[PDB]
Amino acid sequence: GAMTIGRAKVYATLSKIFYHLFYDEAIPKDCREIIEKFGEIDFNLRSVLVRELRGSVLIKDMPQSLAEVYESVMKDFYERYGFQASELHADHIAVELAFMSKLVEREISLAQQMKEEELYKIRAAQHRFIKAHLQPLVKNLPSAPLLNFVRDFVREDAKYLYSSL
């Protein structure tokens, strides 16, 4: 219901914002206003910074052996749920957020089709994805209003999923 729709919207909206910042494009006012519903916020992050918000870059504790194959690790997870990374490295924050929005969009339908077992499985996949990939990425973000918002959202979403599981 309402919760699932909302989660999908936040993930999709954050993803789109990072894609625009990546290419040094203005954020559509439609996207801004969505995040501005939470209140006023600064959307000014340098494209040079945004381009490098990748898991294998931000996570300094990542072993070189893992960082060298991390794209394939990400793509293996994505392919399992029929997702393909658009344009950017598979471990880029924008792509990871887009993948979450897609998992949550599938959850919306499964909840209303009342498919209990598949609903548990999709939520379990979301939590697995956050624990393995997205949360480690976001915990290593530098401090900025947009990035802190993403931190807060992902932290609270994983708690939500853990409790629902």
**First-to-last C-alpha distance (Å) of the chain:** 17
Query: Which residues neighbour 164 within 8 Å (Cβ) at sequence distance 6 or greater?
Result: 123
Residue 150 and residue 134: Cα distance in Å, rounded?
Answer: 10
Residue 143 burial by Cβ neighbours in a 10 Å radius (0-12, 13-18, 19+):
exposed
| Residue 159 CA, distance from chain mean position | 15
Amino acid (1-letter code) at residue 147 = L
Structure-token pair, residue 144: 């900025």
Place of tokens 């494209």: 47
Residue 70 and residue 74: Cα distance in Å, rounded?
Answer: 6
- 3-state class (DSSP) for residue 54: strand
Place of tokens 């997205």: 134
Structure-token pair, residue 105: 């969009």
Element (H, E) at 71: helix 70-80
Technique of determination: X-ray
User: Count of H helices and E strands in the chain?
Assistant: 10, 0
Half-sphere exposure of 9 (CA within 13 A, CB side): 13
Half-sphere exposure of 160 (CA within 13 A, CB side): 14
Structure-token pair, residue 96: 């990871």
Amino acid (1-letter code) at residue 2 = A
Domains and CATH numbers, the chain: 1-165 (1.10.3480.10)
Taking every pair of Cα atoms in the chain, the longest distance, rounded to a whole number of angstroms, is 45
| Cβ proximity of 17 and 35 under 8 Å | yes
Query: Which residues neighbour 146 within 8 Å (Cβ) at sequence distance 6 or greater?
Result: 17, 35, 41, 42, 43, 45
* Closest by CA position to 158, among listed 133, 130, 121, 134: 130
